[PDB]
Design a protein around this ligand. Sequence first.
Ligand SMILES: [Zn+2]
Ligand SMILES: [Zn+2]
Lengths: 66, 377, 17
Amino acid sequence: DAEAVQKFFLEEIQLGEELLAQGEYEKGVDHLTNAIAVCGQPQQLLQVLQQTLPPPVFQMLLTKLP
Amino acid sequence: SSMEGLAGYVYKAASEGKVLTLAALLLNRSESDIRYLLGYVSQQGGQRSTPLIIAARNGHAKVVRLLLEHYRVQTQQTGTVRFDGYVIDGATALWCAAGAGHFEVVKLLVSHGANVNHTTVTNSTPLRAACFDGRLDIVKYLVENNANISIANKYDNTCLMIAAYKGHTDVVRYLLEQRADPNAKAHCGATALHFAAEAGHIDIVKELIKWRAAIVVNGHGMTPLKVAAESCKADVVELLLSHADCDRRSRIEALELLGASFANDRENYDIMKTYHYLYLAMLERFQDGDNILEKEVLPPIHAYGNRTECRNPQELEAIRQDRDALHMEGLIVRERILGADNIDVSHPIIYRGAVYADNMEFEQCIKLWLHALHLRQ
Amino acid sequence: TRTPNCNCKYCSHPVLG
Ligand SMILES: [Zn+2]
Ligand SMILES: [Zn+2]
């Protein structure tokens, strides 16, 4: 269902945002992967995350790729 | 439409700082949808703002970087903002950044090709907003990237004038070094020197005199010396009298105005200074018995007790100890020196009336208030 | 409570601007 998919993507990105801001980096990366997997082509998404994130959480996220 | 609500989501994301959710909402859209959602003027809290300008206003630099680098949001899109209580129509993102003091966003916008000299409906450049807030870093960075210091605003107020009035001495020095005209006149003829003299910022006066500022008489008929005297700024009065070769009439006018203003200013109330300056001016009026500088006194004013201004040292010594007479003399001298020109001289009258009412001398309070109201009409 | 567009005490602008 497209409605559920879009709302889930937005929800996971928000959850990421907040968890990363709090200091819980790993659970935030988990929700970020939940969002990325349901993204049609997270090309520009990964490219943006390359800049808008610290290097270590980006490495954790890329280890969470599959 | 649902696209309008999605634009609302995008505006909320940009206004709060969430870069990830912003990129999520802007993901894989169409350039048509991109332009729509990023040009949608919203309206939250009496502010009409597009996502870029609300982000630049709230200082969310990473959001502005997303917008400028991954998309190409129009750099000169304009909106309406609110700074404290003021409403500002026709403001760009760079102006809001320079006003709110977000140096990072200012650099992000200037580097990506923003109009550094874009003007407000009040014709305010972002350089003027930076000079208002006193952010010398933003002022320097703007001037370095070819911002025009000469552009005045709605009422012909320059960046130098607003910098001198607010007290940012270092910004004033920087502007004066950058070939800013110190003798630039506003719509009424007032210079930055008038504004600096009113506020009492003496270091700005020193710097302006160092750069050879000219003592011009504005439309209100006031030399900066008269402005300093009227505002009970004795330090500025002494400095301006020392540097300028003021003729005896101007010096006596300044001394009398300064003395009279000390008599009914709530903040600077000092009767001893009142009498000192009035008596000094009188003595210098009578320095030469063969060349007495008489004072063209006004007719008796009933509200001031039908009293005539003292015309010789004896008449002034007669009221040396009469505090009420010194108050009335201050009011009389203020009205004689300022009342002819278009100046609102009513506030110290109302203050003296309020004091007399606090001491339950209602008759004199009502006389003074009636005279003030009659002067206003 | 003076206008921010003109820093002249002796003007008589309509507050606001
Ligand atoms: Zn004026
Ligand atoms: Zn004015």
